[PDB]
């Protein structure tokens, strides 16, 4: 059987071969870490982050008018009006967070320029109307739009001739030469959806059209719309469209519609249903009456089969463009694009490489190029060669998820 | 200049190279201790002998009193007019407040947090930074102890990841000359108990940029709007800092095939995954941030997370071969006292299916069984009992040799 | 269960009392135990008896308390439990019926489950993850060990797996002696014979034998216990049935 | 055969606190609800005086016979595990009881049936001549 270690054995175990410097070591590390704790506590932080200006800017205004500014003015909470009684001085207001009150005007404000349906300032006590305010411009929508030009050209997309032609037809031509359609007697579409396998090359084309657009471009975050409070997503959707309508010739771009919504289901009690409302607020605002005009919208996704069929109604989404894997000239052209900025041996032919990657998209070819560069780095070389690419191809395309590597093409000769 | 290196490393000094009870180590740690005491003494004298102080310019107290004592924090949303901006509080109640002086009217921008009064509710300052204590906590500042010396021999993988994350920093002359962008994404996959987190620890131990570590099933909140916002802030804080690196562990809790179904919570999971997927490689820019992502089963991942361009290198950790077992045994028993009888050849060759953690457990079990009978030195029979008696759960297959 | 209590004591109490012993001998302290066997054999007796003599702070996450309604919070409960265990430095956490969580990781889609898997991955990370814990022990108990997920059985998380086999003859006699203390046994009752009349007894049913003999005595308004009462209790507790069809049996030769 | 009447007869003359709960009440829509209500009913009974718990039908959640491979089978198995844990687990409670009534019990999970958890097993067979005589005289 077995036995349990007794006190005396424990005592002797901590005794033989202890060496002459055992505890004399450990106590050192002990007080080391303790004094570490002490020295880090004795250090905290400093701020200097209040935004105060140089004292000269303060001037003596601090006493003169800042002191004479707290007491004279009032907060004047801001709300909207919904139903203006006419010739009847009683107005109705809603705080959109509070209830609705019947209220009136103040003494100094004329009762004429108080058009119904606009933001107004309101006293905290008597809820009187004091001043008008311009319609809200949403803080997040201001930086929603790109206001910048990514430097990707139509010259940098290879192997997608037809899709580029169709996209151009939808977007550019009606915005520059709007006479062919009325000459023959047709009407220009206002919606294009993009679909294909992941990596095929969509968002790149979207970035390309945002370079030679000569018009407003708006990038839209798919995940920004949903919100924690109730009744927020729809509000931002309508602000987006109204602000778009304010200016002329602005483009809209969306990504992963399947994030916002592509199906409708019953129940979902509680939190879920909110997003439903949001998507509806888009749809009825996308169409209806009063043709929107030279405002175009783009939809892009990778998972088309999970979309709500209500989106594919003629008038909402008019054209659907498919992106497919490049066949042969696509591959030679893509290689020629990504390998014109690295040092290579000048006598290498790329069609051979185009053969050995049958089912591949642009991403895999770009990675093959960089990989060949890395294999050139590993040995001390300055210029990459044939064997580099030949090895990188085996490294990337085929190597992942191989089968019957040892049998190989034994039976296929 | 951005927030700069913001380096995260205690890493005082590791030189205990004697690794025994020698005098060199005692004198060296003596030097360490006395330097630390010296610095402590200096800071005590620095804080004790300050004789100069007025620090009010006869007006700083004036500004301090003009603004309220319990200042509150709100969100500016528009600035219709000078001296009459419009702000809002937490509850979404807007107020047409005024703007006072002594507030640099240069750095205010719609969406920035500001400091407000109570009684009159005007704008009196600007809050410089606002990061919730769910992202600052993710950061690391004390490096873990291990280093490359402890790894049992993975030359291919180590060289690979070094070309990925370390080399572009120290010697960034080659890549420009060749004209290539270094890879940014790495996946570590394989069976369990092989060393996937050891490389994470070892890389974090020796570096110069910021390190951020996140475990999988933590990007999830229940309020329908916090997941994606937290992801966005994570990448924002990573990019405003130094050339940091981010380590997401146990992913498969987040990304799995993006199918269509009924419940709303699963829709939320998919929404968060998709937001991260955009954040990593979406529209215009990405920045100077690397991402390491580790999992033990890979086939169940969404094809949109794995495609190249987003994750450029994939690294498989296979089971050890007989060359490596000797190295592992040599490492894990280095600081062990040990007898002349034992030969590791038999233990390494008898079995053909075990991993690093298994070897460590064999070592500790054998040492403990030696202790059981009141000894310190370890013999061969102890290792025999350790291997056979436990550390082996079993499986069956290919019965009775159908093949011959 | 002598061997089992020795090894349990060794994993649980030794590394807490004498860490310097493991500093010597140059090894690292074990931190995992798993208990398994057929139902009613003493898995929870050890947990309770350990709680009695612990000299430490005994936590008790048991059953399916950690599966919650909303998404996410079921995970953070684990994190908060472990930090609470760090507040009070030495401690033991005792799970129970753990195959309710982490049976095995299933596929995605409209099948299997996700949320429990998120929680289980959280727990998994929490004890052998990036950051190293110290002076925290775990205990787990289950039947059907063979179905458990294979990411937890690795020697990083669980070190000693202990099986509780059904008692043999000697154990049956000894359990009978423990559970017949307060009784009032007549004379000339040979408990060895009764012990051998119960092949393959589960172990929890020795209590059944004793209580049933007691109730037989009570129904007649008596305080004796004789041997016939024990025998009749033996017959009553042991009960099975077979395929009376006689055709299902015969088709196999 | 008349077992629910015997449960009623116990309810009538008792001096303790009585609860009757239908078994299928434990099935729910949302995740984790069923175990929560099992825990809650046992807490209720424990807080009060000596109590009695009656469970109407159990044929729904009474056997494993297999491992759960799909989703929503594990929910049933988890309910059963919670019941077992709650009835004889770490935290022992005293002065509580449990009554179980189902049809034929050959298919029950042997985790329930071990003594210490479900000690008494009782038959309610079909009446014979003497029983029928008594029933007729009493009813008439």
């Amino acid at each position: 059987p077995i036995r349990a270690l007794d006190e005396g054995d424990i005592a002797l175990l901590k005794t033989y071969g202890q060496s002459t410097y055992s505890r004399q070591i450990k106590q050192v590390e002990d007080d080391i870490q303790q004094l570490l704790k002490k020295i880090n506590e004795l250090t905290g932080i400093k701020e200097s982050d209040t935004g105060l200006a140089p004292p000269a800017l303060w001037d003596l205004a601090a006493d003169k008018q800042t002191l004479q500014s707290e007491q004279p003015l009032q907060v004047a909470r801001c709300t909207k009006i919904i139903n203006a009684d006419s010739e009847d001085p009683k107005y109705i207001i809603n705080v959109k967070q509070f209830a609705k009150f019947v209220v009136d005007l103040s003494d100094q404000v004329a009762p004429t320029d108080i058009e119904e349906g606009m933001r107004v300032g309101v006293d905290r006590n008597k809820y009187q109307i004091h001043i008008p305010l311009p319609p809200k411009i949403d803080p997040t929508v201001t930086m929603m739009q790109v206001e910048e030009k990514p430097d990707v050209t139509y010259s940098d997309v290879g192997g997608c001739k037809e899709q580029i032609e169709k996209l151009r037809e939808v977007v550019e031509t009606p915005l520059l030469h709007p006479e062919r359609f009325v000459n023959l007697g047709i009407e220009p579409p206002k919606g294009v959806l993009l679909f294909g396998p992941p990596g095929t090359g969509k968002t790149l084309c979207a970035r390309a059209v945002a370079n030679r657009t000569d018009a407003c471009f708006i990038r839209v975050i798919g995940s920004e719309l949903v919100q924690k409070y109730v009744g927020e997503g729809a509000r931002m959707v309508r602000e987006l469209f109204e602000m778009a309508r304010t200016k002329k010739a602005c483009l809209i771009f969306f990504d992963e519609i399947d994030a916002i919504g592509g199906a409708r289901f019953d129940d979902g009690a509680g939190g879920d249903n909110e997003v439903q409302r949001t998507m509806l607020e888009l749809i009825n605002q996308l169409d209806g009456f009063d043709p929107r005009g030279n405002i175009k919208v783009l939809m892009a996704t990778n998972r088309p089969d999970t979309l709500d069929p209500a989106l594919m109604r003629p008038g909402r989404l008019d054209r659907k463009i498919e992106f497919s894997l490049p066949d042969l000239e696509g591959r030679t052209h893509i290689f020629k694009i990504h390998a014109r900025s690295m040092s290579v041996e000048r006598d290498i032919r790329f069609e051979l490489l185009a053969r050995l990657c049958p089912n591949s998209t642009g991403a895999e070819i770009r990675s093959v190029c960089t990989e060949a560069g890395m294999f050139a780095i590993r040995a001390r070389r300055k210029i990459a060669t044939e064997k580099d690419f030949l090895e990188a191809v085996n490294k990337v395309i085929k190597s992942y998820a191989k089968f019957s590597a040892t049998p190989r093409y034994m039976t296929y000769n | 200049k951005k927030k700069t290196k913001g380096p995260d490393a205690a890493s005082k000094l590791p030189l205990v190279t004697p690794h025994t009870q020698c005098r060199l180590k005692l004198l060296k740690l003596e030097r360490i201790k006395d330097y630390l005491l010296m610095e402590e003494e200096f800071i005590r004298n620095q804080e004790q002998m300050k004789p100069l102080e007025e620090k009010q310019e006869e007006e700083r107290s004036k500004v301090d009193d003009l603004r309220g004592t319990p200042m509150s924090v709100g969100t500016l949303e528009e600035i219709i007019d000078d001296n009459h901006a419009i702000v809002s509080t937490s509850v979404g109640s807007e107020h047409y407040v005024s703007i006072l002086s002594f507030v640099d009217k240069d750095l205010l921008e719609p969406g920035c947090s500001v400091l407000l009064n109570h009684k009159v509710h005007a704008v009196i300052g600007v809050l410089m930074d606002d990061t919730d204590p769910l992202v600052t906590v993710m950061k690391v500042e004390k490096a873990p102890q291990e280093t490359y010396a402890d790894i049992g021999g993975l030359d291919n993988q180590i060289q690979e990841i070094k070309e990925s994350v370390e080399l572009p920093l120290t010697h960034p002359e080659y890549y420009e000359e060749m004209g290539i962008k270094p890879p940014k994404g790495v996946i570590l996959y394989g069976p369990p108990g092989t060393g996937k987190t050891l490389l994470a620890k070892a890389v974090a131990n020796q570096t110069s940029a910021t390190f951020l570590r996140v475990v999988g099933s933590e990007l999830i909140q229940k309020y329908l709007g916090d997941g994606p916002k937290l992801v966005r802030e994570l990448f924002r804080v990573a990019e405003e800092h130094a050339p940091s690196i981010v380590f997401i562990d146990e992913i498969d809790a987040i990304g799995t095939k993006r199918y269509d179904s009924n419940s709303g919570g699963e829709r939320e999971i998919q929404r968060t995954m998709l937001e991260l997927l955009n954040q990593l490689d979406g529209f215009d820019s990405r920045g100077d941030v690397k991402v390491i992502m580790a999992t033990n089963r890979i086939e169940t991942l969404d094809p949109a997370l794995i495609r190249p361009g987003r994750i450029d290198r994939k690294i498989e950790f296979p089971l050890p071969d007989e060359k490596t077992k000797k190295r592992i045994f040599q490492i894990h028993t280095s600081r062990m006292t040990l007898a002349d009888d034992v030969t590791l050849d038999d233990l390494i060759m008898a079995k053909d299916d075990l991993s690093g953690a298994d070897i460590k457990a064999i070592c500790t079990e054998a040492g403990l069984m030696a202790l059981r009978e009141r000894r310190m030195k370890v013999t061969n029979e102890d290792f025999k009992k350790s291997k056979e008696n436990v550390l082996y759960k079993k499986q069956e297959g290919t019965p009775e040799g159908l093949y011959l | 269960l002598d061997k089992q209590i020795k090894e349990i004591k060794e994993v649980i109490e030794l590394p807490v009392k004498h860490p310097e012993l493991f500093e010597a001998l140059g090894i690292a302290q074990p931190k995992g135990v798993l208990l398994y066997g057929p139902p009613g054999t003493g898995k929870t007796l050890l947990a309770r008896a350990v709680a009695h003599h612990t000299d430490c702070t005994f936590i008790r996450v048991s059953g399916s308390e950690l599966v919650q309604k909303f998404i996410g919070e079921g995970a953070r409960m684990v994190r908060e439990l472990f930090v609470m265990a760090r507040e009070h430095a030495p401690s033991i956490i005792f799970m129970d019926e753990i195959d309710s969580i982490g049976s095995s990781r299933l596929e995605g889609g409209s099948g299997g489950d996700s949320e429990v898997q998120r929680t289980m991955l959280e727990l998994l990370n929490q004890l052998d993850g990036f950051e190293a814990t110290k002076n925290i022990k775990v205990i787990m108990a289950t039947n059907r060990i063979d179905i458990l997920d294979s990411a937890l059985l690795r020697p990083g998380r669980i070190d000693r797996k202990i099986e509780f086999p059904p008692p043999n003859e000697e154990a049956r006699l000894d359990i009978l002696k423990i559970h017949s203390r307060k009784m009032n046994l007549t004379r000339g009752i040979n408990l060895r014979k009764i012990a051998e009349l119960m092949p393959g007894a589960s172990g929890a049913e020795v209590k059944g034998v004793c209580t049933e003999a007691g109730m037989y005595a009570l129904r007649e308004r008596r305080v004796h216990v004789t041997q016939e009462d024990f025998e009749m209790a033996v017959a009553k507790v042991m009960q099975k049935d077979s395929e009376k069809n006689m055709s299902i049996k015969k088709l196999w030769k | 055969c008349g077992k629910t009447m015997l449960a009623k007869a116990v309810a009538h003359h008792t001096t303790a606190a009585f609860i009757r709960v239908v078994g299928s009440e434990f099935v729910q829509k949302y995740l984790g609800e069923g175990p929560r209500m099992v825990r809650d009913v046992f807490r209720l009974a424990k807080e009060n005086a000596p109590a009695i718990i009656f469970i109407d039908e159990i044929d729904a959640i009474a056997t494993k016979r297999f491992d759960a491979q799909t989703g929503a089978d594990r929910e049933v198995q988890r309910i059963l595990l919670e019941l077992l844990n709650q009835m004889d687990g770490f935290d022992q409670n005293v002065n509580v009881k449990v009554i179980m009534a189902t049809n034929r019990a050959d298919t029950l999970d042997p985790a329930l049936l071990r003594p210490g958890r479900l000690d008494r097993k009782i038959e309610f067979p079909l009446p014979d001549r003497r029983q029928k005589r008594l029933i007729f005289s009493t009813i008439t």
């Binding site: 879920d272 | 919570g265 | - | 929910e75």
Partner: peptide, 26 residues
């Protein structure tokens, strides 16, 4: 297709209350 599903939750907005104004205008 049986159900063992789960869901998230939206917050409770109603939290505000009125307070006594303390304007000082002569």
């Amino acid at each position: 297709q049986p159900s063992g599903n789960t869901s998230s939750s939206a917050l409770m907005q109603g939290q505000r209350a009125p307070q006594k104004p303390s304007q000082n205008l002569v």
